[PDB]
């Protein structure tokens, strides 16, 4: 139903106008993008519970440490 594919091809048109890709790459995109989402959500969950300050800096720290 819902497809990120149209937005992905919009970004492609921002980069390359007339290039074609495969469906297996799309499925791997789905898997890896979603597991990145899960990991980034997991990393920045209880950081606000490390000290009594419970935002943007949580996910910023997540991307700072995973990368």
């Amino acid at each position: 139903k819902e497809t990120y594919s149209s937005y992905i091809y919009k970004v492609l048109k921002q980069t390359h106008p007339d290039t074609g890709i495969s469906q297996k790459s799309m499925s791997i995109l789905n898997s890896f993008v979603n597991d990145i989402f899960e990991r980034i959500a997991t990393e920045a969950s209880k950081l606000a519970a490390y000290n009594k300050k419970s935002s943007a800096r949580e996910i910023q720290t997540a991307v700072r440490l995973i990368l």
């Binding site: 791997i28 789905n30 890896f32």
Partner: protein
């Protein structure tokens, strides 16, 4: 209605070694790697059956293989 293994090839195990960077062979190349396969798989299924017997519940969709093998020590992508 059950089937069991017969020895895991001279040829296909040889290609397994071929992509493992092996040209000739010793007497300890074909059989033992399959033994490591069996030991690792028996350990991971031991953990899985412990998980599914402690609470006595079934499993979920094909997303289990990537998570279970990642905890095991070698997971996969592809879809």
């Amino acid at each position: 209605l059950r089937d069991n293994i017969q020895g895991i090839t001279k040829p296909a195990i040889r290609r397994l070694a071929r992509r493992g960077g092996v040209k000739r062979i010793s007497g300890l190349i074909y059989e033992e790697v399959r033994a490591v396969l069996k030991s690792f798989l028996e350990s991971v299924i031991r953990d899985s059956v412990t998980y599914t017997e402690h609470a006595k519940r079934k499993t979920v969709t094909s997303l289990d293989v990537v998570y279970a093998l990642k905890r095991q020590g070698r997971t996969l992508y592809g879809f």
